[PDB]
Design a protein around this nucleic acid. Structure first.
Ligand SMILES: [K+]
Ligand SMILES: [K+]
Ligand SMILES: [K+]
Ligand SMILES: [K+]
Ligand SMILES: [K+]
Ligand SMILES: [K+]
Ligand SMILES: [Mg+2]
Ligand SMILES: [Mg+2]
Ligand SMILES: [Mg+2]
Ligand SMILES: [Mg+2]
Ligand SMILES: [Mg+2]
Ligand SMILES: [Mg+2]
Ligand SMILES: [Mg+2]
Ligand SMILES: [Mg+2]
Ligand SMILES: [Mg+2]
Ligand SMILES: [Mg+2]
Ligand SMILES: [Mg+2]
Ligand SMILES: [Mg+2]
Length: 95
RNA sequence: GGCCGUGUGCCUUGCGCCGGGAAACCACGCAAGGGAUGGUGUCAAAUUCGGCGAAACCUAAGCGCCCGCCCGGGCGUAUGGCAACGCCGAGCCAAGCUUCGCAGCCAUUGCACUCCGGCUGCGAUGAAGGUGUAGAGACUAGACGGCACCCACCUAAGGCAAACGCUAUGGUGAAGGCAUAGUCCAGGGAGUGGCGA
């Protein structure tokens, strides 16, 4: 079910009524204690809606977030988590 | 209401002729004429403040000329006017179109890094157009207007076709809304008084 580890995590199955500006705040409290968040990519577009990308400094931050926050009911919806299949544009330039 | 004339707008035609266009054919200049100008639905709101320009036409203060000079007059003239109409600067506005948020139904389970799915609904912005521009003015409706679409003719870039060729998203179907069709309210027909020459 889970692919190979990454700096960023893929999140799906979310309530699409919430705005772009509001949803970025909710993640900066629950996941910020698992490790410091560099940047959050969220879009409401048809291809990118109900999806979020959370960038950590180290892999261990996301690996525990994968287990401890698995199936977390978010806005009355079961939140799924997978690893991102590609590195971020800011992350890849540092590696 | 009719007939003639001047001006300005208009189309047809002929001429010129550069500019746009792939072509049809638009745009520009002028002369002459008035034979010819497609259809249904749609939307009715803003309708303000200020500025620039105008032909014929009406008139003759100044000036010029003349009546041999003066007293008078005459003759020309707009630089005075009316006004068909050409327009700028700002504000504003129905529906349709561009974009932009905010709700509402509807689809959607989607791996990004640059924004971006459909609608009906409000609320806003942007472009076109309208208003400003009626006899001082107030209303009402359509259209000769904004929008959508249809019909005829003409072209064929692009797309289609192996091919004679097919096809509008491109042209033609005038202007009049500086009040058009109407209803009151002017003005004149019809008086008195300024200002003016
Ligand atoms: K006439
Ligand atoms: K030419
Ligand atoms: K204007
Ligand atoms: K008008
Ligand atoms: K062709
Ligand atoms: K057409
Ligand atoms: Mg005629
Ligand atoms: Mg009204
Ligand atoms: Mg004298
Ligand atoms: Mg004299
Ligand atoms: Mg005269
Ligand atoms: Mg004059
Ligand atoms: Mg005015
Ligand atoms: Mg008129
Ligand atoms: Mg008008
Ligand atoms: Mg008039
Ligand atoms: Mg009338
Ligand atoms: Mg009188």
């Amino acid at each position: 079910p889970e692919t190979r580890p990454n700096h960023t995590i893929y999140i799906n199955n979310l309530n699409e009524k919430i705005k772009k500006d509001e949803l970025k705040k909710s993640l900066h409290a629950i996941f910020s204690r698992f490790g410091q968040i560099l940047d959050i990519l969220v879009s409401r577009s048809l291809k990118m809606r109900g999806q979020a990308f959370v960038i950590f400094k180290e892999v261990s931050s996301a690996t525990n977030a994968l287990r401890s926050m698995q199936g977390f009911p978010f806005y009355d919806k079961p939140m799924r988590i997978q690893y991102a299949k590609t590195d971020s544009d800011i992350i890849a330039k540092m590696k």
